[PDB]
Structure 1
């Protein structure tokens, strides 16, 4: 965990959200894939409510681009201050913000509503009410008296659990912890790395619990979810870059039952 104390947002963003992985022109890439899973899921209209919490946001917003048009109160979270500050820089359109415009444009492209990407960003910024500290290892990840409306109507989390858990069992308990935040009958949208064991974020070198699709499903069942959808992206050679050893990426749409 203390390895995270050297985690550099700019290097992480650069490693995973700038080209090649961040060049969204090719439809077969990991970015378009993640965006499509999220867009398709929200477009069903079965994932809706008023409040939504993004677990372990780090310095990234793409995971909420499609979500924002379905929830008016969105809470973002992360363990590190440096990430919350990096989010703050984009939310407030401050200087040095990361350029997500490519992801915004593609989300609009995929959603097919003819929406311009400026309106999409504008709606996301407006709907993000707060950026909170969080620790998924705590049985109450947000704390005692969090400004966050609980229980949330839906959860979104991307590349968080498997990256903060030393092994399978911890991954399972972390899921249990955040699951307490989710109202019964609510929805979790979980994106994660498959069979990955490390990734780099500048000077920091983070350990990852390698998980498989079935381990992810069993763990969702165990935590009390009905798995509505579970999908896999295999990482093409051209997007394997020396910043990690990720083998694939998974997307799960789970419902608390």
Structure 2
């Protein structure tokens, strides 16, 4: 965990959201696959409400694009100050923000509502009310009196739990912890790495718990979810680049009983 004290948001973005993994042109790439899942899922319209919270946003916004059109109050979170700062730069259109436009575009491409991408980005930026510090290891991750409407109508998290838990159990408790933020009946949209054991972010070298699909199923079940959809994307040869050892990527649409 103290390893996260050397994490570099720029180097992370560059490693995971710039070419090649971030060249969205090939539909068989991982960025399209993620966006498509998110988009397909909301497009069902069974996932809806007023508030929503993103767990462990890090410096990234893509996980929220298709989403932001179904929830008026969006809360973003991360454990580091430096990421919350990077998010800020893009939320306020400040100088040196990261360019998510190619993502917004595909968001718009995939949803098929003929929306323009500036509209999408504007809708997001407006609906993100607050960026909050968070620790998923605490039994009350946000703290005591968090400015976040609780309980949330849904949650979204990508590459967080799997990335901050040393081992399976640690993962499992982390899940329990955030599931407390989710209203009963609410939805969890979860994305993470499959059989990833490390990944770089500049000077930082994070050690991670290589999870599998069945392990993710069993763990959502244990935390009290009905698994509505669980899908697996296998990382293709040319997307393996020595910033990590990830083998595939999972997406899960879970409902709290």
Instruction: Tell me the TM-score normalised to structure 1 length.
Output: 1.00
Cα deviation code 1:88-145 (max 9, x no counterpart): 0000000000000000000000000000000000000000000000000000000000
Q: Which runs of 5+ in 2 are unaligned?
A: none
Deviations 1:11-53 (A, max 9, x none): 0000000000000000000000000000000000000000000
Residues 40-77 of structure 1, C-alpha deviations (whole Å, 9 max, x = no match): 00000000000000000000000000000000000000
Structure 1: 5+ residue runs without aligned partners? Answer: none
**Could you tell me how far apart the structure 2 residues matched to 1:143 and 1:200 are?**
29
| SS of structure 2 residue aligned to 1:143 | coil
Match in the other structure for 1:36: 36
Distance apart, 1:150 and its partner CA: 0.2
Query: Matched residue pairs, number?
Result: 257
Matches within 5 A, 1:138-217: 138-217=138-217
Could you tell me how far 1:168 is from its partner in structure 2? 0.1
1:240 is matched with: 240
- Work out the CA distance in 2 between the residues paired with 1:158 and 1:58: 9
1:233 partner SS: strand
- Partner Cα distance (1:162, 1:123) in 2: 29
Using structure 2 for the length normalisation, give the TM-score: 1.00
The 4+ residue runs of structure 1 with deviation greater than 2 A are none
Distance in 1 between residues matched to 2:162 and 2:13, nearest whole Å: 18
How far apart are residue 208 of structure 1 and its match? 0.8
1:200: Cα distance to partner? Answer: 0.1
- Say what the alpha-carbon RMSD is for the aligned residues: 0.2
